[PDB]
Amino acid sequence: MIIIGIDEAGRGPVLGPMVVCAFAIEKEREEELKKLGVKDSKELTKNKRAYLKKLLENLGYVEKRILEAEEINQLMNSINLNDIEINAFSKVAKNLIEKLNIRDDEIEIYIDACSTNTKKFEDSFKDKIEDIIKERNLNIKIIAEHKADAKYPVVSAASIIAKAERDEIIDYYKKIYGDIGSGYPSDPKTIKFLEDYFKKHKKLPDIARTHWKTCKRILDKSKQT
């Protein structure tokens, strides 16, 4: 059977994209994945993650979904972040199952619940893919839990790939905006970037997520007085 891990990267920053990745492989090639050393701590450097991605992509089937801040802002005009995650996680799952044309077999999906309601996340996920599962006569096993990229290899692979992809996009933003920092408000470089940018253009830059506190607060303040 096929074993699939799904995770995401970039959920926390006030800027940049979110990347959702599903990583699938034959359960029989599982020892091969472990040997690749994905069983590493989440303390990897950007360079090491980039290296690992190359090996991982050669080993399994990789489905990716990149949501730039502009799409995230648009979607959030109607649905919240948790819905976006549920939708994106289910979409890469269904897309990977359809592209590999998996059917009439067992299948296992491991997902990393990055939000506060693990059970809600898993139940929503299964509700989204139930149609395709039954339609394809698949006998699925779904497992959702926090910090899953720390315990299930395929989820670890999905995580590393999603973060490496995000790193690539962010690296090029620097050529457009300069040193934008880590993307978190704990970094003066990121605060300086957004504040200085807004002061000059009277609008947030295209990569800013309008619904994150840091950015909303900047907008709320511009409207005072």
Query: Would the annotation count 8 as a binding residue?
Result: yes
The radius of gyration of the chain from alpha carbons, rounded to an integer in Å, stands at 19
**Footprint on this chain of a second copy (rule: CB under 8 A):** 35-36, 46-48, 50-51, 54-55, 57-59
Q: Least CB distance from residue 59 to a second copy, whole Å?
A: 7
On whether 206 is known to bind a ligand per the annotation, the reply is: no
Task: Report yes or no: 121 and 144 within 8 Å, Cβ to Cβ.
Answer: yes
Q: Of the two residues 57 and 145, which places its CB atom closer to a second copy in the complex?
A: 57
Q: Is 196 annotated as a binding residue?
A: no
> After which residues does the chain break, using C–N > 2.5 Å?
none
Residue 61's nearest CA partner among 91, 34, 92 is 92
Q: Report the residue number, 40 or 131, with the smaller CB distance to a second copy.
A: 40
The token duo for 165 is 């992809």
Beta carbon of residue 48, minimum distance to a second copy (angstroms, whole number): 5
Listed residue (170, 160, 159, 162) closest to 16, CA to CA: 170
If the CB atoms of residues 51 and 177 are measured against a second copy, the closer one turns out to be 51
CA angle 52, 57, 61 (to 5 degrees): 140
The distance of closest approach from Cβ of residue 16 to a second copy in the complex, given in angstroms and rounded to an integer, is 18
CA 4 – CA 155 distance, rounded (Å):
8
Q: How far is the CB of 95 from a second copy (least distance, A)?
A: 21
CB 176 within 8 A of CB 161: no
CB of 215 to a second copy, least distance (A): 29
Q: Rank residues 57 and 187 by Cβ distance to a second copy and give the closer one.
A: 57
Residue 48 or residue 64: which is nearer to a second copy going by CB?
Answer: 48
**Token pair for residue 189?**
């470089």
| Binding residue ranges | 7-8, 112
| Binding residue ranges for a divalent metal cation | 7-8, 112
